[PDB]
From a paper:
The [name] transporter system is composed of a periplasmic binding protein, [name], and a type I ABC-type importer consisting of a heterodimer of its transmembrane domain components, EppB and EppC, and a dimer of its nucleotide binding domain component, EppD. [name] binds free [name], but not metal–[name] complexes, restricting the ability of [name] [name] to use only weak metal–[name] complexes that can dissociate to free [name], making it imperative to determine the biophysical mechanism of [name]’s binding specificity before any improvements to its binding capabilities can be engineered. Based on its three-domain, bilobate structure, the β2β1β3βnβ4 configuration of the core β-sheet of Domain III, and the two-β-strand hinge, [name] is a Class II Cluster C periplasmic binding protein. In summary, [name]’s affinity for [name], EDDA, and EGTA, and its putative affinity for other APC chelators via molecular docking, suggests that it is a general binding protein for aminopolycarboxylates.
[name] crystallized without its ligand [name] in the tetragonal space group P43212 with one molecule in the asymmetric unit. For both structures, all but the first four N-terminal residues (Gln27 through Leu30) of the mature protein (Gln27 through Glu563) were visible, and the C-terminal His-tag from pET30a(+) was visible through its first three His residues. Based on the relatively weak (e.g., no large, hydrophobic intermolecular interfaces) crystallographic and non-crystallographic protein–protein interactions in both the P43212 and P212121 crystal lattices, [name] is monomeric, which we confirmed by calculating a molecular mass of 63 kDa for the single chromatographic peak observed by analytical size-exclusion chromatography. The tertiary structure of [name] was bilobate and composed of three domains, denoted here by convention used for periplasmic binding proteins as Domains I, II, and III. Through the comparison to other Class II Cluster C PBPs and the support by molecular docking of [name] (Section 2.3), the interface of Domains I and III established the putative ligand-binding cleft, with one end of the cleft capped by Domain II. In its observed state, this binding cleft had a volume of 688 Å3 and was solvent accessible, as shown by the presence of 35 water molecules occupying the extended binding cleft. Highlighting the counterbalancing charges, electron densities for two sulfate ions were clearly observed to be bound electrostatically in the ligand-binding cleft by Arg56 (water-mediated), Arg74, Lys470, and Arg480. Of the four cationic residues identified by molecular docking, Arg480 was the only residue situated outside of binding cleft within a short loop (Arg477 through Gln481). The loop had two conformers: Conformer A had a refined occupancy of 60% and was held in place outside of the binding clef by Asp447, and Conformer B had a refined occupancy of 40% and was oriented toward the binding cleft.
Numbering used by the authors: 31 to 566
The structure:
């Protein structure tokens, strides 16, 4: 029985001074997390201490307005939708220049698809729904007017950049694509700022002397040490080379090892991630273009056994995920997978689905309706996730009674970015869920979107997602979006499995360090990090 909540784990009041080193798994070649090439958890973690945010995702998956930056943010009208931001007078960049509407306007122009068509952004995420963005004479009152309703407005302006510096480095595209992406940032609007960068080795941050927030910073230096081999991170922690690690794809052996290091002052936190494992099925081409084969495969997969073999031995009460649009804790969630018989391990039902579509078993091999053997299925998955490797082998075994064979494929060319209609049949990977399911869904399920790898092609799904993204609450959005989840599961091109576990493993002298099991991650509150005081 504990008094800590997910939002208050490891709380305390640290002393002043000292250093903390946090291991990260990628080198930094792009410093702009909002760009296409900078959008990953490492860049996000390393730049969260320097980039101010209007709202921040918290460990309970809520959005909290940043009261260091903002006095208020208010939806002041809905005819048309209007949001007013009042920036604190004392919010300033590290050179003393106030943070103002100039910074909101610059970011909006880079993200809105219109004013900077050459900006190489990750995604607009609704900034394009803002049609006018104006500021008062003081620069501290910013009014956004929308061309149509948009639920996810608190997700906007989550990363602000110094417009007065960008303007010294070319036009907007040049400054966004070059200055803000390629240069080590000399500026900050947060508690820390970069002192030095040793490529491939170490980012060193120091306090921003003009930090304007309520708390911190407490450390003399905050360092991010680059360790690309994530399996060497626990050794580095034990040796004192780093004080915090946050590896992806934690295993039972990793948990047991970390637990054995308690005598060295090491502790750990683990939670269900916003990242969720899935198996995608190639509905565009190859054997999986036949929905009957997709449904038969999904019905034969035994999801209980999959989780029993790969999660249950070291993770208690770990939830199945039976939706492709909602995590188990989000409004709208239901087991739409199991409602359709997917994941039930039901070989006889799967064989019936195949027989009713004209397939036949001959000599232990499945024949397509024309009479030709179904090809060996190409099941690919990216490296670095032992659970995915184990699940690929288990899935091979579940479908072998259907007369199907698999070829297991991996390596650096087996990433989602490199998928082609012609180079896979099944693919195991993960998606990262967002606070607004309808916003994430618009990136995955629409024709011609960046993450529609498995061939969803349904104007009704797209219409539903658009209505859900226009709703006035997350709850109403979920009620609307549930219909799209049903239709997406009917199509059987995406099979949800379960959430990845996070693993934050660290020296317990560090206070206010806690898991934030979402894309924003543990560096959401570095102003509060510090070392516990020893006794005088």
């Amino acid at each position: 029985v504990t008094g800590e909540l997910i939002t208050t784990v490891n709380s305390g009041t640290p002393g002043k001074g000292g250093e903390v080193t946090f291991a990260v798994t990628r080198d930094i070649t792009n410093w702009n997390v909002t760009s296409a090439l900078g959008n990953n958890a490492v860049v996000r973690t390393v730049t969260l201490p320097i980039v101010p945010s209007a709202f921040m995702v918290q460990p309970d998956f809520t959005l909290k307005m940043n009261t260091d930056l903002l006095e208020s943010a208010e939806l002041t009208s809905t005819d048309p939708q209007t949001v007013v931001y009042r920036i604190r007078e004392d919010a300033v960049w590290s050179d003393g220049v106030p943070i103002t509407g100039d910074d909101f306007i610059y970011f909006w122009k880079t993200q809105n698809r219109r004013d900077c068509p050459e900006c190489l952004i990750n995604a607009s995420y609704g900034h394009d729904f803002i049609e006018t963005l104006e500021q008062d004479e003081t620069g501290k009152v910013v009014t956004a007017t929308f061309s149509e309703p948009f639920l996810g407005w608190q997700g906007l302006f989550m990363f602000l950049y110094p417009a007065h510096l960008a303007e010294k480095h070319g036009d907007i595209a040049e400054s966004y694509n070059n200055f803000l992406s390629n240069e080590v940032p000399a500026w900050s609007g947060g508690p820390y700022m970069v002192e030095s960068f040793d490529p491939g080795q170490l980012v060193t941050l120091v306090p921003n002397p003009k930090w304007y927030g309520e708390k911190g910073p407490y450390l003399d230096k905050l360092k991010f040490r680059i360790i690309t081999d994530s399996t060497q991170q626990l050794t580095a922690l034990e040796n004192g080379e780093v004080d915090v690690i946050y590896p992806q794809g934690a295993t039972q052996d990793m948990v047991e090892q970390a637990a054995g290091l308690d005598y060295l002052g090491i502790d750990f936190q683990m939670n269900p991630s916003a990242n969720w494992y899935f198996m995608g099925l190639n509905s565009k081409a190859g054997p999986m273009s036949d929905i009957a084969l997709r449904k038969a495969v999904l019905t034969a997969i035994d999801a209980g056994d999959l989780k029993a073999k790969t999660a249950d031995p070291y993770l208690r009460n770990w939830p199945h995920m039976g939706s492709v649009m909602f995590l188990p804790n989000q409004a709208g969630y239901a087991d739409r997978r199991g409602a359709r018989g997917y994941g039930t391990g039901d070989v006889e039902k799967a064989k019936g689905i195949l027989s009713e579509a004209g397939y036949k078993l001959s000599g232990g091999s499945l024949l397509d309706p024309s009479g030709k053997p179904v090809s060996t299925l190409r099941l690919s998955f990216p490296p670095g996730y032992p659970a995915a490797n184990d699940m690929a082998r288990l899935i091979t075994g579940y479908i072998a009674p259907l007369g199907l064979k698999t070829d297991l494929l991996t390596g650096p060319n087996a990433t989602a970015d490199y998928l082609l209609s012609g180079n896979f049949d099944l693919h195991l990977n993960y998606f990262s869920q967002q606070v607004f399911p309808a916003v994430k869904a618009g990136q995955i399920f629409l024709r011609d979107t960046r993450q529609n790898y498995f061939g969803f092609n349904d104007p009704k799904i797209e219409e539903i997602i658009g209505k859900a993204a226009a709703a006035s609450s997350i709850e109403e959005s979920a009620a609307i979006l549930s219909e799209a989840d049903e239709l997406a599961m009917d199509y059987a091109a995406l099979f949800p499995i379960y959430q990845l576990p996070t693993a934050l493993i660290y020296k317990e002298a560090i206070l206010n360090l806690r898991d934030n099991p979402n894309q924003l991650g543990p560096a959401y509150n570095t102003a509060e990090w510090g070392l516990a005081e020893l006794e005088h």
